[PDB]
Amino acid sequence: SQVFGVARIYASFNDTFVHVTDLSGKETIARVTGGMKVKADRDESSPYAAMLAAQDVAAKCKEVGITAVHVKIRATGGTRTKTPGPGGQAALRALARSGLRIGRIEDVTPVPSDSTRKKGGRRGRRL
Template structure:
């Protein structure tokens, strides 16, 4: 078998993600938190709601099914979302909290 050719790569440039803003200017996003009695969703979009920046659930952070809707799982999900928002340069969030509603209870679950 012939030896593999080595590919030389040039110097990597710093890639800036997110919008170009001036110093001290706020970049807003919308954090939609859906807290049911079975799971907690934290979904961050841009202001129009069309571009998803980050979406993390409580079930993605804990192993046990019974802990998906716990406040601890919601806290871990919020930490991941905050880290991703900081990477992309989002400095402010509008928070919208939603519960299950309908014929059932209108109060959010324990993860809200």
């Protein structure tokens, strides 16, 4: 009923990424992060900035042509944390409350058949 695209939300710690693209992926449209919509470096990942970034994203989305979208939220992944960051659910909340539509949302965090030694060495990051 609507026009569909991809939301794709990389929500790590220390920042949260949102950017809508073509459903094929190649051509992307409107981005902006949390590190953008406030300056404080340490406040780069708080749900507040994430919301404000979902605001800017929704604004251009409904300014170019996308009326709907599917989200693929995503943590750092790889050999790192693997657990969803602070400002993705808030970005989700803010982009649904925007006025855009929503349909089907799977997670795409890279999970390995494990390996490549994790950083920080055997004795652990100790502090």
